[PDB]
């Protein structure tokens, strides 16, 4: 096995996958390492195993059927792999947790939202269509973008866009197009 951290490329207490050689810290991998469990399958394992037993699941799909689609097993899997890639970045750090607002000629965003808040909803089951989780996802850049206006920081909500929308086009095997 690795002997860093997947997610955060920390060494530390890591937890091995037992059908690859990925490691994790307890609360970087999504869901949180399970308890017990011999063997242990990482999310990226769960992943490909969906794929493999289902190979057409890679066919191209329009973004709007998947949206609504209702938040099963295999769409809650999805989603929290998702999320998992962009904490993969390290410039995630800048969108984990609460954000406050206090900045000459702005305003705070009617709805803030964080990645931290994303994994709660998605842990407490609070989504019932893939729309709902994608929509909060949106929301972090967005709020980002119309804060930080012509500062340069706002580079940082478009970088971290990229990093989600690249991965949910993968993910849910979105038809590619021009
Ligand atoms: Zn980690
Ligand atoms: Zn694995
Ligand atoms: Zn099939």
């Given at each position: 096995n690795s002997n860093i951290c997947e997610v955060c490329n920390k060494w530390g207490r890591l937890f091995c996958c037992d059908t690859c050689p990925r490691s994790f810290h307890e609360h970087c991998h999504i869901p949180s390492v399970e308890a017990n469990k011999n063997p242990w399958s990482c999310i990226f394992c769960r992943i490909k195993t969906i794929q493999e037993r289902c190979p057409?699941?890679?066919?191209?799909?329009?973004?709007?059927?998947v949206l609504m689609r209702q938040m099963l097993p295999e769409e809650q899997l999805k989603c929290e792999f998702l999320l998992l890639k962009v904490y993969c970045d390290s410039k995630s750090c800048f969108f984990a947790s609460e954000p406050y607002y206090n900045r000459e000629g702005s305003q705070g965003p009617?709805?803030?939202?964080?990645?931290?808040?994303?994994?709660?909803?998605?842990?407490?089951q609070m989504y019932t269509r893939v729309e709902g989780?994608?929509?909060d996802?949106?929301?972090?850049?967005?709020?980002?973008?119309?804060?930080?206006?012509?500062?340069?920081?706002?580079?940082?909500?478009?970088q971290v866009q990229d990093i989600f929308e690249k991965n949910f086009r993968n993910i849910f095997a979105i038809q590619e197009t021009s």
């Amino acid at each position: 096995n690795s002997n860093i951290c997947e997610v955060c490329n920390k060494w530390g207490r890591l937890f091995c996958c037992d059908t690859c050689p990925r490691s994790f810290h307890e609360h970087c991998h999504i869901p949180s390492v399970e308890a017990n469990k011999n063997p242990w399958s990482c999310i990226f394992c769960r992943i490909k195993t969906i794929q493999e037993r289902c190979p057409e699941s890679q066919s191209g799909h329009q973004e709007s059927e998947v949206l609504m689609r209702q938040m099963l097993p295999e769409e809650q899997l999805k989603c929290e792999f998702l999320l998992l890639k962009v904490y993969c970045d390290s410039k995630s750090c800048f969108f984990a947790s609460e954000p406050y607002y206090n900045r000459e000629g702005s305003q705070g965003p009617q709805k803030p939202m964080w990645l931290n808040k994303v994994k709660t909803s998605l842990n407490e089951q609070m989504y019932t269509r893939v729309e709902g989780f994608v929509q909060d996802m949106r929301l972090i850049f967005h709020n980002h973008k119309e804060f930080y206006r012509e500062d340069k920081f706002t580079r940082l909500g478009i970088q971290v866009q990229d990093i989600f929308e690249k991965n949910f086009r993968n993910i849910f095997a979105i038809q590619e197009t021009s």
